[PDB]
């Protein structure tokens, strides 16, 4: 059965980007998925997206602009202190000049650069570049 909604959605987006598609439909949706997409949008990796209501777990239609290379989830969600950011950056990011690691913290869901500036740790959710 389906165990992780976030992992299912990120795999679907990555495949459509690799195949050169312009739009991709994601099902089912959740609050965590929407927050992850907004972090991507803020940094310019995807376009606009629309959430459709169906009285169940809804669906999302996302517009792609060709700038995304890969996105994926990290399972299980390992704990990350403020001293572990360097280790995660060197292990799953192509370089130190671009790419982001997404975390969930007490202050909300954010990328590693914002989290470090505010001096907070948390759990790793995924990545994109």
């Amino acid at each position: 059965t389906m165990m992780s909604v976030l992992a299912n959605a990120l795999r679907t987006i990555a495949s459509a980007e690799r195949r050169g598609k312009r739009q991709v439909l994601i099902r089912p949706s959740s609050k965590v998925v929407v927050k992850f997409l907004q972090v991507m949008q803020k940094h310019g990796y995807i376009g606009e997206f629309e959430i459709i209501d169906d009285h169940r777990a809804g669906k999302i239609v996302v517009n792609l602009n060709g700038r995304l290379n890969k996105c994926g989830a990290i399972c299980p969600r390992f704990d990350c202190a403020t001293t572990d950011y360097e280790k995660w950056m060197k292990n799953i990011l192509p370089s130190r000049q671009f790419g982001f690691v997404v975390l969930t913290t007490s202050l909300g869901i954010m990328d590693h650069e914002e989290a470090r500036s505010r001096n907070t740790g948390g759990k790793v959710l995924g990545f994109f570049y």
Binding site: Q23, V24, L25, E50, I52, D54, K59, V61
Partner: protein, 84 residues
């Protein structure tokens, strides 16, 4: 051709050829009808996919033969699809 497709706003031709649970938003296939009676001429509301026995009150009471899909209506009655 020459026209792209928006996943968020599909065309009527594509949306019509879809399973009821494969549409953008799922929904029913059935409806209700107003049905008359043979030699009795009363009014009854009948489901389009009825499987139990639907009978006319105070009459022969034989109508709505059940099948594997839509129910069959006896030729002695007139039926009209109700709105909504």
């Amino acid at each position: 051709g020459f026209f792209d497709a928006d996943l968020s706003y599909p065309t009527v031709r594509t949306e019509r050829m879809k399973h009821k649970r494969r549409r953008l938003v799922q929904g029913p296939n059935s409806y209700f009808m107003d049905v008359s009676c043979p030699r009795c001429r009363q009014v009854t509301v009948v489901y389009s996919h009825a499987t139990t026995s639907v009978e006319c009150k105070g009459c022969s009471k034989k109508l709505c033969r059940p099948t594997g899909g839509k129910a069959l209506l006896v030729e002695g009655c007139g039926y009209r699809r109700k709105p909504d």
